[PDB]
């Protein structure tokens, strides 16, 4: 068992908004939960885009999840990751 390296990135900056992508990589086994949350509440499926849970080529796997937010609301959003018992919550950089 290998825990993922979670990493949040900010992209597509315009009109006071940004796209925030939560990457989870280098993990095993394949099964994982990854979702953006606003105030600890999981976002709708139709407000997020998911990367497929696919192999690295080193025996481990990677996935991602992204959503659009407003600048000034970063503290309000978190990426929740759960994987083989353990779980964690990751902030948006500002």
């Amino acid at each position: 068992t290998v825990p993922p390296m979670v990493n949040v990135t900010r992209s597509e900056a315009s009109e006071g908004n940004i796209t925030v992508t939560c990457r989870a990589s280098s993990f095993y086994p394949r099964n994982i939960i990854l979702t953006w949350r606003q105030d600890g509440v999981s976002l709708s499926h139709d407000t997020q885009q998911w990367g497929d849970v696919l192999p690295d080529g080193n025996g481990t796997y990677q996935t991602w999840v992204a959503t659009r937010i407003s600048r000034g609301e970063e503290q309000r959003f978190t990426c929740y990751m759960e994987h083989s018992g353990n779980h964690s919550t990751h902030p948006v950089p500002s």
Epitope: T21, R30, Q49, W50, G51, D52, L54, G57, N58
Partner: antibody
Framework: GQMQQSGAELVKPGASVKLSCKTS????????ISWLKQKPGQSLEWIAW????????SYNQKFRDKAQLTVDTSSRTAYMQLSSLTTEDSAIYYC???????????????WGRGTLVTVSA | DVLMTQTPLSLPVSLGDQASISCRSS???????????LEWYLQKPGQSPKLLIY???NRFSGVPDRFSGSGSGTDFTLKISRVEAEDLGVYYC?????????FGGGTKLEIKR
Amino acid sequence: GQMQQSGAELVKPGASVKLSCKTSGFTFSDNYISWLKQKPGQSLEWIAWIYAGTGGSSYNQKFRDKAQLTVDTSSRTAYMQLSSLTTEDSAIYYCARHDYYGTSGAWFAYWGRGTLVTVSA
Amino acid sequence: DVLMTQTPLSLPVSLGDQASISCRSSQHIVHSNENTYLEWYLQKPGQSPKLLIYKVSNRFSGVPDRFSGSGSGTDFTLKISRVEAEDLGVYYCFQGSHVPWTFGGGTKLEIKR
């Protein structure tokens, strides 16, 4: 972006050749680079992919001893080394990328123009 | 291996007519992550293959809505609702679900004029 493949190669039987796929206009490290084989007037085969971010790879077992994929992050360029060439290795060889973040689960979303390899004495 | 059989091998169709191509796999192609990586490509003459459809039914960016993909189990179909002249070329189905990944034999679309 762009995916510039090297010009056609003539190579002797038993020799090897290193094909290149020089790229630009996109985040190279966030892409699976696959290599595919097409003999003119026939269908295609998948050889292997390499994820540029990790250098990790998956190989079609048919091309296990044939092909060796590598990636140079600095130059944003992918390489396939083919070795012990026979006449049956004469084909068009394509590099294609899986835009993992832009269109996830689409394996050959953008292609190079192809390098024609002719194996002959 | 997953064998991929297409029908027909050649497909004459009149301009503005509906064309459809079948792709039959020898076994199921649901990846263990529960996606079905069936993809359709069009190779125009003198060009490399171009992506039309991924994961069974998802139209790739730039691809006109006249192109449509569907199916499940071992039975998959690409449909073109109003065939324009630029649609001619060879169509390939592909599975990226089970290693080794495998292409269909190809379906040659010709404009019947």
